[PDB]
Structure formats: structure tokens, C-alpha cells
User: Fold this.
Amino acid sequence: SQEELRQQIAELVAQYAETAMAPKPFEAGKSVVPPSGKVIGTKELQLMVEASLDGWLTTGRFNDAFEKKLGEYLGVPYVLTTTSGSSANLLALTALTSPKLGVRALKPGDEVITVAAGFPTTVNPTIQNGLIPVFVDVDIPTYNVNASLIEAAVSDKTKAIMIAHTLGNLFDLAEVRRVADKYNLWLIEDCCDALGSTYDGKMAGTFGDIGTVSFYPAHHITMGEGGAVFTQSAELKSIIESFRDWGRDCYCLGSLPFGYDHKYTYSHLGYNLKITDMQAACGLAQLERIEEFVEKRKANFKYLKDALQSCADFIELPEATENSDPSWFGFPITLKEDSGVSRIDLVKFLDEAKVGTRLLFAGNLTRQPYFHDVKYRVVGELTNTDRIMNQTFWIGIYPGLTHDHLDYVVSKFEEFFGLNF
Amino acid sequence: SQEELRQQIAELVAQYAETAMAPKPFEAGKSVVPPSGKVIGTKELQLMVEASLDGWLTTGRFNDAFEKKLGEYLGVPYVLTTTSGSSANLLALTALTSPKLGVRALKPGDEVITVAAGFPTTVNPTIQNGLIPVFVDVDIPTYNVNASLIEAAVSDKTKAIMIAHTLGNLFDLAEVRRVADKYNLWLIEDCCDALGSTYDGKMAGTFGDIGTVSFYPAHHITMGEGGAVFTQSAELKSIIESFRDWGRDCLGSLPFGYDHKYTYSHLGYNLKITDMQAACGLAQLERIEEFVEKRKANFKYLKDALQSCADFIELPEATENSDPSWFGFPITLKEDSGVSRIDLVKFLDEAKVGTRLLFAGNLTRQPYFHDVKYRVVGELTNTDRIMNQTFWIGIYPGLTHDHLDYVVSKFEEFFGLNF
Ligand SMILES: [Fe+3]
Assistant:
């Protein structure tokens, strides 16, 4: 019997995942403390096998379940899965170029306000659609836009604001919101690293017109490769979907003959950025643990910050943005310049001690080699942005790290700083 | 033991597949004859479970195997998997905008010669990179570019030729190459529908600088969603890869000893797949030779039998000196037949016979082309004819001679040839 063969395959899988996905006890000196990672188990492997058995391959049963459950978690009616966080950002900004949006459709030459201290694909979509990025400085130790600088970047060409809640910490949604409204600007919330974060009690990604998230292994939940675009607007949802699906027409011009297959009628300049149900299944399992993961990240963050307070004379510790409850992606630290050493020294020392580190992504996008010939504007100076590029880095606090993992990390900072003496 | 649980699961799925993925017998009037489809079995489901079990998720073990085996099948050293045929086309054209190609790099305002009778994503990447598409007419009944018209579309802004081997039939490679070489133009072969096709005995996709293929279900092999970009140039491979991977390197004013993993040499996307997708495709690769021969067989059989309707419809013809791996069976309804394409398509639909039009028909007439900037050299006569009178039906591995026999009888019935 079929339904029988499945339940019995689920068993052999649920028992394989017991050996395979079993966490190993921490062993100082030998065990590593990566900066991020995935935490999967029996459920993940079970659903993926189910999806495999289905033999459907393209999105369906599991993808429907996933989009629905994530929509309920975020509290939004429209969720569309795509190939990655980057693809999500690309689809978000590109959808706003749709001629169906009339006078407020983004056009080549228009401007989009953002920050230079972020991830490349948060800004690439703007440049890839012919628009112009306008940068303003960020704040330390929140590592998010200094919202007070946004207003001065606005001009006649300003058209939207696309920014990411860096490392799960939220950006001043009150000031960004205020500016967007006053000038009727579109707001795209890049929540690729902030799934679960909240501001003023409201879930991140539900303040703007469109929100994006990533499911790469680093992140709160994974599908291996995957991401999602979400919104509260039916119109935008239909536009996004069209751009993701070959640009073919939907919801419900040119000179095609009457009775031309609708399946082959294209209303947008489109890609094909869909995923498989195998990917969707993994993410569905992961969704069951999200609340658990968000809680643990907040726990590890506090524990690590309290314990690392002993080095406060040499490093600046991270601070959540006022009136927010971030779902931390990582733990951002800035080495003080008058400490006597370079970030290279600390990073390398930690590396030898098995403690993983990551710099704050691009550091300063404008200084990245690929920005050599890009057309952009910067309002004010990127002082803090350059400091981040030179002095900042982050370490792990993800669900896979226990108190023993963190205790080891704290002792290494102490050792490196001679505070154990 | 873990090695046991695996082999034990392999068996349980091996018998699950024999029941689920079992081809049911054809039944005139009940069974459908779709235009395309996938043929998967035990191997596919087995590897996908293996990959699921690995728990690696991102590309790895199976993807390495897939890119390797496919590179061996095509006869190229570099194969890079991506999310879809469309993403592959996007990466192929975009990669040629890399400043590392120097004076050879594609710039906004430059032109790319192609045809309007095709799939949107074959041309969109040109428009998305700021370039200008230049169209020329196609030929009937090969449904591929009328190569003789290409030379006249060449101007001082021309930099590349990107066209697909429509429905598996090959385009005049001898002429395209001649023109490409004479003007030092880049050549991108869109083989999304031509995996296995050959021209002058050489595998399609190995004549140009970059080749692309799709793994969507309707296609020669599938991963559910997936595609690949391939080439013989190590330089391009590195560029393609960078654009696919956040645009990271491997200039600017970054501090010394800045993490190379966070140094970005291109304006990038993230168009990678999972090893679950790669596994499925790896299984599929074990059947490609079988699928290519069956499609060629179904094609011959269908064309021969359908010869009885030659007074009303124009039958497909392989391009001279080629051996196409047919994706579908393209047919053009003659205008003086007294009926319209809608009539035949609807009749066929009612009889459970699937049909598809030739994709965009004429891209320049598609609504999204309303304000696009492009040039057309000559007239798109045949292109417009295709948009109005052409359509295709299935000949994929899932179709048996009984499936085809039924299709032929319905065409005859339609035209009153059975009387
Ligand atoms: Fe439709």
C-alpha cells in the first residue's frame, strides 16, 4: 500500500535524523562557534522526503502550506516564495516599475534612498532597474540608518526608500514612516535578516508596501536556497507574481490576435524565479520552530552582552533600536580605535580559537570595487559607515549555540584583552 | 547502520515509485495527450531522498556530480547550475557586461541581434542590461532565424547574437558563425529547448561563447525548477559564477585584509539551487540518451502519419545538416483552409489533445513590449504568420505510438479525411 509505504519511510527517516541531526556536546578547544548556521531535524528531512515522493517537483502542496503559515506568522495576506533573499529584493523593487502603477511607477533616473552599510543585493535591484541610489549615514551601535538624515536626501527625483533591518535590529520605523508619508514614497522593508523582529509591537516587514526575507542557511529559517516577498496589497501581489513568472499576464495593449493563449501573453519584463516544493517543505518544517529560534536568539544575545560587558573599555557592545524587540541575526561589535590593535588581530586571534567572525557585509558599498562606475549620490558623509567598514564585525548567537559555547567566546575575548589578569 | 537505514529507505521508495510512477495504458477518449511533460521514476525519487537525508541543502555532492556529468554529455568543461532556464539566459548575457572583458564588454546602448518569434526570457536579459534588441524574420517550417537576414542587421553598435534553437530544431549555425566571426560578435546559444540537438554532428550549445538550458518539467530533463549555463572559457565561467553568487570576487577603497568573502566585483544576484534539485537532475541525466532517441522517433512517426493532412497544414522540417532533439511538433495551419487556428485548437482540446502556440508569437506585439526600445530590420512576415497560424503538439518520451495514432485520427477527422 502507498499510504503505508510512506508512514513507514517516515519512520526510517525519523530514526536516521536521530543519529545525524543530534547536537554534539561542547568541547572547548575542539568545538567551533560559527557566526551563524542552520538547525534542522527530523521534521525537515521528513517533509522533504514527502515532497520528493509526491513527484510534483514544482511548487504546490508544501509551498501553499508554507506561504499560508508564514503569512499567518508575519500577519500579512500575501506571501510569494522565490529563489533567494536577493531574488526577493529584486522582485520587490522591480514590481514598483510596473506601468500599472501609473504615475508612481519607478522610472530610470528616479532615486531610492538607502544606506551604504549593508548587503549588496539590498541595493543592486535599484541599479539594475536604472534607478539611482542615494545614501545617508548609519548609527552605532544599532548599525541602522540614522533616520534623521533621510529627509535631507529627498529631492524631486526621490521615489522610494529601500533599507534592511541590519542583523535583525530594526531601523527607526517611526521616522522612516513619517518621511515616506510626507513625500508619498514607496517603502520596501528588507527583512532578510530580521524574521521575527518587531517594532512598537508590530512585526517587521508589515510597515512598508513590500517586505522581503531570505532562507539561506545562515538565516532564521532555511530551505537551502530560497526567500519570499510579502505584501498587504492585492495589486502589488499580482504584479510581483507576474514578474516572477516569466512576466506573463494575470490578475484580471500589444497587437496579438484575438484568442491568443493567455498563458503566452506577457504584461511585464519578467524572470523565472520560482522554487521547488522540496525547498518549500524544508521551510514548512522550519516554520514550526521559528518562535523557538527567535526566543533563543534573544536569550543568547542578552547572555553574551552581559558577559562581554567586562571588555567595554575596548569594544562597543550592540544596542537594540529604541522601542523595538529585534530578532537578532548576529552579534555586532565595534573595536575601539584607541585599543592598540587592528580588527585583523582580534578576528585572527578568534579564528585560531575556533570562534567565527564576519565583517558587516559590504562595509561601505560605495568603496566596493563593483561600485567603481555606478551612478549614485551621497548626502552628508559616511563617517560611521567607514568606521563600520574598518572597525566592526559580528559573531554568533544563533539557536545552535548554547551557554557553554558563549562562555568559551567570552573567555577568549577576556584572554585576548588580558582581562583574565 | 546509518548506511543501512539509507539502503532500507532506498528500497521502500523503490517500490513506492514502481506503483506511483507507473505509466497507465492509453485509452482513446479518456487519456490525454499533453504537449509536453516529464518522465520520472525510481532513480529520481531515490536521489532526492538521499539529498534530503544529507541535510546539506545548498549545492554540493549531487550538484558537483550533475555539472560534471552534464559537461561530459555536452562536451564542455564548465557547467554552472542556476534557478531556471531564464536565470541561465540572464547570467549568460549579463556576464558579458563584465568590465573584465574590457573593450569586448556589452554596454548600455549596444545591440544584440535576435528574433521576435521566441520566448520572452531569451530577449529580456538584453533589455534588462540596457541593451537594444535588433530583430530579423524567421523561417517556416523550421521556425528558426532566416540567417540570410542577419548580416543586414549588423551596425556599429552590434555586439552579440543571442537566439534559441527553437523547439529543438537548430538555427543556421554555419551562417550565424560566419557573421559572428566576421564582426567579432559574441554568440549566446539558448538551448533551453534543445538539449541533445546536434548540428553538423556537433552538440548544440558548444558553438557559441555561452550556452544555456532549462530544467522546467516541460523540458528534456527536469529538476522541477532549474537550469544551467555552460561554456568552454575559464574566464567567462568565473564571471558567470560571480554574478550568480552575490557578485562576490574570485579597485575600490576597502581597508587591507577585508574579508574576501565580502568583496564584490560585480553587480550581482543570488541564483543558486539546492542539492535536492541537483539530485533529481542527476537521475534524469541517466535517461537523456533514451529521451532524445524517443523524441526523434515520435517525431518521425507523427510526421509520416500526419502527411495525409498536407493539403491543410504545413509539417515541420529539421534544419539542413542538423539532427534536432525535438521539444515539440510545430504545425502551421494554411490560411486557405477555411478555418482558423482557434477552431482546430478547440477541437483538439475537446479530444483531449494538448496544444501550445509558438510562445510569444511575435515579441514586438506583446503588451510588455509597448515602450521597449528595439530595432527591426526587414519585415516580420513569417513571425506574424507564426503568431497567427502556428502551434505545436507533443512528441515527448511520455507519448507512445497509440498516443500518436489517436492524435493523427483526430486531425483526419477534423479535416474530413476519414471520408
Ligand atoms: Fe490564464
Summary: The two ends of chain A are 69 Å apart (CA to CA). Chain A has two domains: 1-289, 290-421.
